[PDB]
Design a binder for this molecule. Structure first.
Ligand SMILES: COc1ccc(N2CCN(c3cccc(C)c3)CC2)nn1
Ligand SMILES: COc1ccc(N2CCN(c3cccc(C)c3)CC2)nn1
Lengths: 273, 40, 255, 236, 273, 40, 59, 57, 40, 59
């Protein structure tokens, strides 16, 4: 492939460099339309800018935490982090979010990876070996209440059991209602005068539930869960302007008030170098 | 070799090697030729 | 001039005619047939009394009144005393059979009411006591009398609550079982052909009933003004393709 | 010795994975299969059998009576019953259809709603059933109702009427657990002319109503049902 | 495959929507019999509703517990949870049970998975590493009595040894006496006047015995066993009405007295939306 | 590839792709045609 | 039983590796794709569309 | 393989059920030598009683 | 596939499918026919 | 290095499984078999030989 062809002096009536940008086109002008060039080859394919590659590496999408401790006398397991759910979403952490929102609709399979590490912040004789259970409680399913509900039987709901310190990995097909995931949605769930606005009203993929299967030892053990997400088989439509201001909420486009100028001011003139 | 039955379980896809910027760079209704005048 | 409506079933030395039928159901779309060798286990040649057992026995009649809750019969129990069918039953170790069930209830074009006639394979009843109380033998072997769902709880008997099918499921879903309605305005009989359904090729006829026939009023009986407020319901049932095997001394069963 | 590398996920137990295992009983011979009528292969086979809907839900303890929709003689213009179409909740919820839908997260497809009339044979009636697609309110009078999917039913010799709620939807799947964006409409029924009883007859007549799914139907993404739970393991 | 064909106005003598439900049939009526439709395709196969899929994921069927402690002076090992059996059955936990009882007879191979985790509720210097032995004591075999009987030699009885914290996995062929497993049984074991009623009289597959192989350390260690069961090669006959009331016992259909109405009462009229 | 000798040890079965609701939805003895009268 | 040896790196999680995984939802059927104008395949496709430069940065 | 063949009434001079155990043999008598039987197949091979299986765990 | 060189290292043997009880059930010197008299 | 994943059950010992193992005595030659009357192949062969029943159990 040639990156530049050889081109010499020109004295024409045919001027490729004068255009009318009002038309909305970006005319494909090249170095050889306005200087004299020599042949050179590309030596490159643009492999690593493919959208599959761009969205295809694992990104941290969520960090939560649960603890193993005596539940005796706990009136609210959920509240003691005896167990914890995660109303699943990808808008939480901003790194991957800015990348996805370069597109309007996106479609891809997900390959999640869950790392769990334990901490024992206060005096323990040892480090116990805990098994985590991660169970996907899709919408319309019983929601745990206690850390050892009938729920956790999860006879019809996919669940994975792995050890703290290890990692669990499993992918799931693209479970969108539509043909693709909306990255934006300028609508409502119905014509209500007070119903929410935006994506949130589409993001309804349930929540992920985590718990330790082990009963309690004499000390307490903090287990912190990190969920990583990798898109595989990516398809993206309609590019948009990149995010400039900071994010404030999962699912709304809102930016913070009295934010700071995002364009760097010159130290000098327009004329400055 | 796929070891698994479902398609979601296969590895990453392989390069589009599609590439056609004209839907974005030249969505004009009447074709523009480089070198010919923009507005006639 | 054949209508879905008029029918004749002749089986053995007995015939039934209905002039107001609503087709007939054949459970699971299969018609009773004898036991093939490829499916056989017991090495004994079986006995097939044919026409002496495969005829129509009419059980004693019930009375549908505005307060009726529904009735339940078990097979082969209901027939335990009918003619030679019954003798064969007590005298062989094993037996197998399909049936034609014909439920009858006629009224006039001023009455309203609708019965559900359903056959439930393996209808294991629940104790009204709860917990793990069992349902004694006698209680699940009412004989031709069947069980009267509007009778009182008894001790060691089953629960007789209709919205729960006598087992913890809702009346509304009984329609997943082969069934037919008798709607006075349409229908006057219900006929169901039952093929033999079991997890073994042949079984004992006394320790295990393989279907319960259930007739349940769903739209209450409503008679014309100053009519007598009740109608009789009659059940006639015929064993079909019956086979008995392992003949001997003659079972003695509780009560 | 062949060199290997183990990946993330090694040693995990995923209740949904499908692999080979050693048999604990090497060489054992299972009992022969014999033929049994009734084999089921797909839950899609059974949700096409219709079952009764306790439409008359207004009672206070479960009763045979909540299956009966009453009809009044001589009323004109008026409304017989109304319900939204959240098949995973409300009237639908205990029906076989409702009960299976609850094992899945998403459903799509047409529903078949039929009404069987049980009044005396010498009576007569004309009813209108209307399906209102998502976007409008439950109709408030027949005029409103009749502008959407509807069937004038003429009560005759043929006892049942089968109304279909054709799949009307932007999004190709809806949630089985009730959700707004994903909502399916309303179903109402009104007198078209009116029920008329013959002489010597009196009182209310009832309609029985059934629901089953058309062959159209799709259910996906299995999950656990809210319809059953427990507090301690059972024992014998 | 078409999901709907195109159909237009109709003015016929042929009315597919009038039927007689008294017959017991559900006539196959479609949208196109009563409105004007357009063609649409199914795009779907009904894969995930196959009974193999429905009963084919692991469900928790049993949680038991045994402890490692000094048996010195224990007069009843079984009673000290020195070891524990499990009169095997699937009726115990309700999630999987409601799923199976949608059918009358069921036939399938089982693939069991056993997770074992340890707990040390009171002061230990460390976490010991225990090996569990799970031995299938079919009916007619000697039954342990002590946690280190000759029984546990299990020279003819399949047994698996795995480590606490790990998982053991092994499947077993369909070991039913009949051609299929009965989900219900309206019979007795014989014509006795007082003999039990129901399935229980068929469920006689023995019991599973668990024990720790390790002798005792200075502290005590609680090991809790969870058995998961996955049906593979499923065959199901005769569908039945789903379970509506709660369960009370393994193997009987009995429901609790003064249970609550299972059909939700309307907040409003029959006419309400 | 099966690594094991016994059939019970193989993975899950593969979709019936059988599907025939008529044993449940139309177990009537005389065939009913949609469009023809139910009761003649 | 086939003899194996594990190499350095076993058990690591590299966010950039690309391998197969079991599907949590065996047999599930995704929604059909419909056509949507605008598909992007390479970031190289979009950086050829011109956009305005805030050249007058002096504010 | 048949487990039992079909066999009917017999009135013979050929009695397979009378033997002399003093000989040391166990004569191979079957159900069909003394009652009327119907055909049935074995459906079974005797796999799990092979001595390799018996001593092999 | 055997991964090992020695025969002892291979898995269990496979069913004799030999089966001949006559060395045990009928070790008589002069053949006995069922149905013929035992002692002539 | 070929990528692998280990499944549940790894490391377990099931007394009934049947796999290959290294021989501790590489290259050893077993004693030749000679003929011995009486070989048994199936327990089904022997349960067809009749034996006496202590029917008179009353002692
Ligand atoms: C905004 O775009 C997206 C893109 C993907 C996505 N989902 C979140 C839910 N997720 C998921 C689906 C099934 C099971 C589990 C654990 C997670 C798939 C990706 N959510 N939003
Ligand atoms: C009610 O239906 C069933 C269905 C299956 C089942 N069994 C229980 C025993 N089980 C089993 C069989 C052999 C070995 C071990 C550990 C367990 C197989 C499944 N029991 N009941």
């Amino acid at each position: 492939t040639v990156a530049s062809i050889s081109s010499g002096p020109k004295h024409t009536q045919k001027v490729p460099i004068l255009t009318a940008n009002e038309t909305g086109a970006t005319m494909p002008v090249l170095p050889s339309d306005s200087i004299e060039t020599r042949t050179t080859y590309m030596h490159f394919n643009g492999s690593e800018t493919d959208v599959e590659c761009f969205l295809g590496r694992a990104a941290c999408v969520h960090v939560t935490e649960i603890q193993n401790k005596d539940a005796t006398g706990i009136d609210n397991h959920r509240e003691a982090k005896l167990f914890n759910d995660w109303k699943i979403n990808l808008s939480s952490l901003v790194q991957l979010r800015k990348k996805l929102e370069l597109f309007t609709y996106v479609r891809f399979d997900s390959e999640y990876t869950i790392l769990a590490t334990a901490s024992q912040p206060d005096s323990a004789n040892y480090s116990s070996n805990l098994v985590v259970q991660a169970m996907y409680v899709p919408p319309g399913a019983p929601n745990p209440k206690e850390w050892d509900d009938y729920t956790w039987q999860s006879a019809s709901n996919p669940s994975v059991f792995f050890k703290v310190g290890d990692t669990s990995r499993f992918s799931v097909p693209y479970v969108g209602l539509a043909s693709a995931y909306n990255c934006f949605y300028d609508g409502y769930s119905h014509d209500d005068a007070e119903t929410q606005y935006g994506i949130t009203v589409l993001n309804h993929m349930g929540s992920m539930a985590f718990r330790i299967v082990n009963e309690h030892d004499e000390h307490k053990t903090l287990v912190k869960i990190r969920v990583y997400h990798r898109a595989k088989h990516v398809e993206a439509w309609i590019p948009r302007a990149p995010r400039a201001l900071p994010y404030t909420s999962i699912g709304r486009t809102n930016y913070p008030k009295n934010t700071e100028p995002v364009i760097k001011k010159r130290k000098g003139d327009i004329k400055s170098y | 070799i796929n070891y698994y039955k479902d398609a979601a379980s296969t590895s990453s896809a392989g390069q589009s090697l599609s590439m056609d910027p004209s839907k974005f760079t030249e969505p004009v209704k009447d074709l523009m030729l480089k070198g010919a005048p923009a507005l006639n | 001039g054949y209508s879905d409506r008029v029918q004749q079933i002749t089986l053995g030395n007995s015939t039934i005619t209905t002039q107001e039928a609503a087709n007939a159901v054949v459970c699971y779309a299969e018609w009773p047939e004898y036991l093939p060798d490829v499916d056989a286990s017991d090495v004994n040649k079986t006995s097939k009394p044919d026409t002496s057992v495969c005829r129509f026995y009419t059980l004693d009649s019930k009375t549908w009144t505005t307060g009726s809750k529904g009735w339940c019969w078990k097979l082969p129990d209901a027939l335990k005393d009918m003619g030679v069918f019954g003798q064969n039953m007590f005298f062989h170790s094993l037996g197998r059979s399909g049936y034609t069930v014909h439920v009858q209830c006629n009224a006039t074009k001023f009455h309203s009411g609708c019965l559900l006639v359903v056959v439930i394979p393996e209808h294991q009843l629940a104790s009204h006591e709860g917990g793990n109380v069992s349902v004694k033998y006698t209680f699940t072997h009412p004989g031709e009398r069947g069980i009267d769902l509007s009778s009182a709880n008894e001790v060691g008997g089953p629960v007789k609550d209709v919205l729960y099918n006598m087992n913890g499921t809702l009346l509304g879903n009984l329609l997943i079982f082969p069934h037919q309605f008798i709607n006075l305005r349409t229908n006057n009989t219900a006929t169901i052909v039952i093929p033999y359904i079991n997890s073994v090729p042949i079984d004992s006829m006394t320790r295990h009933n393989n279907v319960s026939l259930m007739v349940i009023p769903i739209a209450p009986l409503t008679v014309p003004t100053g009519a007598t407020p009740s109608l009789p319901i009659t059940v006639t049932i015929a064993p079909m393709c019956t086979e008995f095997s392992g003949i001997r001394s003659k079972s003695i069963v509780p009560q | 010795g062949l060199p290997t590398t183990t990946l993330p996920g090694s040693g995990q137990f995923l209740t949904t994975d499908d692999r080979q295992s050693p048999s604990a009983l090497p060489n054992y011979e299972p009992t022969p299969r014999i033929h049994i009528p009734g084999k089921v292969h797909n839950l899609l086979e059974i949700i096409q059998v219709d079952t009764l809907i306790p439409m008359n839900n207004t009672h206070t303890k479960d009763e045979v009576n909540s299956y009966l929709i009453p009809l009044n003689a001589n009323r004109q213009n008026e409304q017989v019953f109304g319900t939204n179409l959240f098949i995973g909740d409300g009237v639908f919820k205990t029906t076989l259809l409702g009960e299976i839908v609850q094992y899945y997260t998403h459903w799509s497809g047409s529903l078949r709603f039929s009404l069987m009339y049980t009044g005396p044979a010498l009576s007569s009636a004309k009813l209108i059933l209307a399906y209102t697609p998502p976007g409008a309110r439950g109709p408030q009078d027949r005029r409103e109702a009749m502008l959407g999917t509807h069937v004038v039913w003429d009560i005759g010799l043929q006892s049942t009427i089968v109304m279909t709620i054709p799949w009307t939807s932007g999004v190709q799947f809806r949630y089985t657990d009730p959700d707004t964006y994903t909502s399916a409409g309303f179903l109402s029924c009104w007198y078209q002319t009116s029920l008329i009883l013959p002489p010597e007859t009196t009182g209310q007549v009832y309609l029985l109503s059934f629901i089953s799914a058309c062959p159209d139907f799709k259910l996906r993404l299995m999950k656990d049902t809210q319809t059953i739970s427990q507090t301690v393991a059972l024992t014998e």
